[model samples]
Target: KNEPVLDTDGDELRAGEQYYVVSAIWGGGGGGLALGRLTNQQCPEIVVQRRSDLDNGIPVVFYNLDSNDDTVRVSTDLNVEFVPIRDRLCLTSTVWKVDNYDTSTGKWWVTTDGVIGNPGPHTLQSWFKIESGNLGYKFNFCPSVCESCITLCSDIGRYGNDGQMRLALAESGWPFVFKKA
Candidate 1:
């Protein structure tokens, strides 16, 4: 029997294809988060990669500015962990996995196991909002429970006051862009 097929976006499903996952809010203006290096504990800096670097990637992993090395890799049985550095603190063991997608709303639901390893009952839902002049789409994340969302400033994890790292709420949330490679 023949049946219609669809992809994650309800388009024709393809095999052996990959997509490029980029931060909706971080792609421009010198990258986004300044993830520190685990090997040398170098100054925290944002990691930037163009569409050319989509050859590979991972979770809880950091690619240096050169996009050739895994400056840091973190994993834990717990939900999440913050590794403090000389300048700021970096998230070491948090997991954000795609759980589901709503075709009706064109949104994606991502589940997180808390930041310190403790899983949460709720998931993070994100959708693409049109940019100025409808030129591009901006990915945004929000709590499924309708709670206030936080934003991490571009300087997050970089040298600053108190030398502490924390998640802050942002009305805009974090934007991301997904490109098929």
Candidate 2:
């Protein structure tokens, strides 16, 4: 039963709750990725972190624990970002922008307007839903150029690739979920 607590500044978060930004479609079978320490000093870029353990070829889920300041916060302006944790580095502020809101679908398009290591206009859609008695959200990469959805992959060590910063989607679903913890 994870419920969001509103702060004095009007930030939405759970004071002591942790969560994983996972793929909604695959559920726990496929793990999620987290923002690691900023890889560069000059830029607001972060390294993607995943569990060292492999589960059927995919990385294990990374828990964003509250005890370590791993809780997520939604800004009053509707932007989303990770709260700084003792062991993890994060953007100084909002990392993802809330572009459009669809009340009927309970969906919103979140994008990065070119972060430190990444390029501009990378878009992903988030769907809010209740699952298994938990309230959470799922993420799916949505490229404005594509007629259909493409899959998103962590370029990881290959950030040099031109496609590394592109808002790409895949034929198969690779949705990420952020469930209440």
Candidate 3:
């Protein structure tokens, strides 16, 4: 294991606990970095929605897809899953997953359309990973869950479309740091 994922306070990232996935570039400022979902193409997609006052957008908890370990370790080298604390309007579970390959945009959408719990129907697309990066720790999508299942390996990045920042798999990962909430 290289190092346990550390929070802003240099504390180890813990499972079953709420944390703000803040962007490394422009994060913090009274709850602006926490993630939120937005309406997209008749479905809700994960995005950084502006927060009001000092309220964090939405806290998420990470879950190791197959392992029972309480702490997510990169050395474990297993796909991990995270879920929003609460649901928004369109989506109920708010678990992140890579949407199906859409021909319209030709880009796989990282959507909030997911179900609670793991080792289920959409687990392949729902699996995610956290890796170390230049700027900071970055999220990746190189699912090694199912040995026989087809998968894509890429880093999670913000796709700027029409002034809206949407999460999607790209060459460069969006470096981020966790803030314990």
Candidate 4:
């Protein structure tokens, strides 16, 4: 059992909470080709950020862990809702994103949350995987030229490719995970 209240602003795991962390080392791989292949030694750092406020919604502190070991890695904290069922902790929503660039179009795309507009020609080729215990996600994108591709693409009037996304999770009969925070 994790401590109900954790001061995560500082550097330290709050008492009583379970966390998932994955750290990785990356090689100087090229784009779309051998994107994230750990050569020497890759270690991913997947951490569960703590939150004291359960009123906001979810009880667990979530983070977007990176596995590519890139210089410009990103991480976000989403206080999503979750609950324990039998032997697994289920999340109420699936929130994840991946970043990638299309080789032909030479444009970047962010995928992972959900499927956005089709990437016309460039399809999500590869991505980096981040994991924290049983929970994890990957970010990848493809090439597309559609104005409605705003979910992942940054520019709405560009010839570059759009982002392709993918997601997975453990599910039972019910779709909504009971709020247990």
Q: Give the runs in model 3 whose Cα sits over 4 Å from its true position.
A: 27-45, 49-56, 75-88, 120-122
State each model's CA lDDT, in order. Answer: 0.27, 0.31, 0.63, 0.23
Among all candidates shown, the one with the greatest lDDT:
3
Residues 10-96, model 3: lDDT tens digits: 888777777777666663322333344444443454555343424445567777654456676653333322444444545445577
Ranking by TM-score: 3, 2, 1, 4
| Candidate 2 Cα misplacement greater than 4 A, ranges | 1-18, 24-30, 37-42, 47-49, 53-78, 86-94, 97-137, 140-173
Worst 10 residues of 2 by lDDT: 154-163
What tens-digit string does per-residue lDDT give for candidate 1 at 74-114?
A: 11011211122234353322233333443543333233322
Candidates in order, TM-scores: namely 0.27, 0.33, 0.77, 0.19
TM-score of 4: 0.19
In model 2, state the lDDT of residue 98: 35
Candidates 1 and 3 compared: the better one by lDDT is: 3
Tens digits of per-residue lDDT for model 4, 1-181 = 2112112232333322333221111122111111111133122111121121221222332322222221212122122212121122322122223334446544343222222223332322222222122212222222233334443422111121212111222121101111212
Measured by TM-score, how close is model 2 to the native structure? Answer: 0.33
Give the residue spans of candidate 1 off by over 4 A: 1-18, 23-28, 31-94, 97-135, 145-168, 173-175
lDDT of 3: 0.63
